[PDB]
Ligand binder design. Structure first.
Ligand SMILES: CCCCCCCC(=O)OC[C@H](COP(=O)(O)O[C@@H]1[C@H](O)[C@H](O)[C@@H](OP(=O)(O)O)[C@H](OP(=O)(O)O)[C@H]1O)OC(=O)CCCCCCC
Ligand code: NA
Lengths: 527, 136, 76
């Protein structure tokens, strides 16, 4: 079961001996046997090597160009080019699979991709290999986008072909050239709208598990597309949403600031203008809360996170949902004749005013600043808080054990007194109900030297280091955050670009249009 | 009078080191203080509104008084017990601790870090701008 | 209006063919025509290339040293 399925063709191809391959092919051995052994499976154990489960794929994935030429140009039994393995992957799918983002590996993978594409055009002009979709329902371009294969995606999105009867395969073109400036056209077929899966939505909605999700959008055409769509309509839509949220928060603040404070809600409606306005404001605030609650529900239903990216991705969505939950609990408590509705609503109010920071995206500098805040909270504050809490609790317990009796004989009071040192308000004499003054002073001085002088300054230093280290990463994360905003704005409910002619004739008689997107560049050398 | 005493700083040009220092002040004011002030004002206003809504009555039942009390934390003079006219002490303490952790411990130190980065990045630009200021 | 004003001299200079330039100059075509087309204007749209609106300037601005030598040393 482990090695089962292998045939002598596989061994001959592996050892890289042309003479033996030809001699074995003389007998007529089938060249379509699939090796289903677990060693040839994807990840069934640490030992193994996935190559597509066919001799053609094995040759393609192991620096065997002459061998694949032979297999595709042998009279006894020509090798099929569209063959699909058990997983559904073809030769191009396997080539995408074996890519691992290394300079030599990327160079070889792209070279073999191009060569096989040209050969397939030559033997089978009608057939188009780029549309063959594996059993997972993904084309090789979609597979490259999902898997994080930056090199393959970059090569595919902007390939050019300059040979007879196979120029139609190219994706970038050149509309015209004049002097040092020439205009190039990029094919937007299945990048922004595909109705099943496209490069943009595959990259944006990919889980955090994918390796290069941040760097994937830096490929030229994608950045140009995102900026174009933004400037076209998304900027105005986003500004309107930001304005509406500001108005909603202002209304909520005004309504909460003027609560009637009389005891045991609900409260009656006094016949006055101010009371009517207050009732209207609170109704509007509750409406906003329920709207956000429903939005969060449908987001969770649609994206359906893996139950672990919830704590790693979609922080904004969970924060907005928690705000809505606080508002709804506040309403329920209010109509149940309880005063804790005030506590719930103040928590919701503070959460909403902080969530105001979400709209910081859409402005480059402020977006970078917010991304930096998010990183800092995740790393530095967490580690600092763990160590600081340990120290504070230990020294608080020691001090409160020392004290005999009085106001500060409780753990909470002494913990608060010890914490006051951190904010520049420590007393050093807040009590005298102890038997030993030297022990008290030594404990307090040790706590001060350990936290205030050491840990806070080290936190400043580590923050400086992190700030030094995460600039480009912050910019890339901001770009991804804006791309997600653009895609969501489109989906909530514009087109790619102008239709144009590039080849004028496919291999067949009829011509084709492929929804191109123009880019202009200037060159001063290589005339 | 205050504006004139601050404008005294214009004549700092004509001396190389002090001119560079003033140019750095100008850059810092333009970038770092502006971004920090926007975010800080948002946080301060939000938490002030929450706290003042919590309070029932008394001296600190006004938005201005509570905003000033919250601001005092930034300058190392926050009280953490400035009032008691509320129904829930846990909510009050949680709000104040959240505000402190979010501003005093996080944002101020991040501002120091970003100031350090900017200082690292703008030396030659500051010297060139000083040269242009002297040429004018 | 877009491409208007261009003459065969401009195309000959652009393609960088000395033989055709000389042959065309044999007929005596004027070497002072100004291309006023919007493509040749400064920034009238994203497409365009400003070069001064003269064959001499076009040669000077496009790595044509032999061409400008010829235009400045032609007897006709
Ligand atoms: C305990 C609180 C936890 C929530 C706070 C978490 C700390 C914080 O600052 O909020 C972040 C949130 C932005 O989060 P948002 O989900 O939209 O942006 C994504 C987030 O950074 C995820 O980590 C990733 O998701 P994915 O890959 O695309 O799928 C990706 O970045 P990366 O990691 O991959 O590089 C980003 O796309 O900002 C706010 O709106 C609230 C205002 C800040 C107020 C903060 C007050 C808490
Ligand atoms: Na102090």
């Amino acid at each position: 079961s482990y090695y089962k399925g292998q045939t002598a063709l596989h061994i001959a191809i592996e050892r890289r001996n042309m003479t033996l391959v030809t001699l074995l092919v003389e007998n007529g051995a089938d060249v379509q046997a699939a090796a289903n052994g677990d060693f040839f499976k994807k990840t069934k154990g640490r030992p193994g090597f996935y190559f597509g489960e066919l001799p053609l794929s094995l040759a393609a994935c192991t620096n065997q160009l002459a061998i694949v030429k032979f297999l595709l140009q042998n009279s006894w039994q020509p090798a099929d080019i569209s063959a699909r393995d058990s997983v559904g992957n073809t030769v191009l799918h396997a080539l995408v699979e074996v890519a691992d983002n290394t300079v030599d590996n990327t160079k070889f993978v792209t070279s073999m991709y191009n060569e096989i594409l040209i050969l397939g055009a030559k033997l089978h002009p009608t057939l188009k290999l780029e549309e063959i979709t594996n059993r997972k329902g993904l084309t090789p371009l979609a597979l490259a986008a999902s898997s994080g294969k930056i090199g393959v995606l970059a090569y595919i999105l902007q390939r050019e072909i300059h040979e007879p009867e196979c120029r139609h395969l190219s994706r970038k073109f050149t509309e015209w050239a004049y002097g040092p400036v020439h205009s190039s056209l990029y094919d937007l077929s299945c990048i922004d709208t595909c109705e099943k899966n496209s490069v943009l939505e595959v990259i944006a909605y990919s889980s955090s598990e994918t390796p290069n999700r941040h760097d994937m959008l830096l490929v030229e055409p994608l950045n140009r597309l995102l900026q174009d769509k933004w400037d076209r309509f998304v900027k105005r839509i986003f500004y309107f949403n930001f304005f509406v949220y500001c108005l909603y928060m202002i209304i909520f603040t005004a309504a909460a600031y003027y609560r009637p404070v009389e005891g045991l809600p609900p409260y009656k409606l006094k016949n006055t203008v101010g009371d009517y306005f207050r009732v209207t404001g609170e109704i509007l605030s509750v409406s906003g809360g329920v709207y956000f609650f429903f939005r969060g529900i449908q987001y969770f239903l649609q994206r359906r996170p893996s139950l672990k990216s919830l704590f790693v991705d979609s922080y904004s969505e969970i924060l907005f949902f928690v705000q809505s939950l606080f508002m709804l609990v506040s309403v329920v408590l209010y109509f149940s004749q309880r005063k804790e509705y005030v506590a719930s609503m103040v928590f919701s109010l503070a959460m909403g005013w902080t969530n105001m920071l979400y709209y910081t995206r859409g402005f480059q500098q402020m977006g970078i600043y917010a991304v930096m805040i998010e990183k800092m909270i995740l790393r530095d504050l967490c580690r600092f808080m763990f160590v600081y809490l340990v120290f504070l609790f230990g020294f608080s317990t020691a001090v409160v054990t020392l004290i005999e009796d009085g106001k500060y004989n409780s753990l909470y009071s002494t913990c608060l007194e010890l914490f006051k040192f951190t904010i520049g308000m420590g007393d050093l004499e807040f009590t005298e109900n102890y038997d030993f003054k030297a022990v008290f002073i030594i404990l307090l001085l040790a706590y001060v030297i350990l936290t205030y002088i050491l840990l806070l300054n080290m936190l400043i230093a580590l923050m400086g280091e992190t700030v030094n280290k995460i600039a480009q990463e912050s910019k890339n994360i901001w770009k991804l955050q804006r791309a997600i905003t653009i895609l969501d704005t489109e989906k909530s409910f514009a087109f790619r670009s102008g239709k144009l002619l590039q080849v004028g004739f496919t291999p067949d008689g009829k011509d084709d249009y492929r929804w191109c997107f123009r880019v202009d560049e200037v060159n001063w050398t290589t005339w």
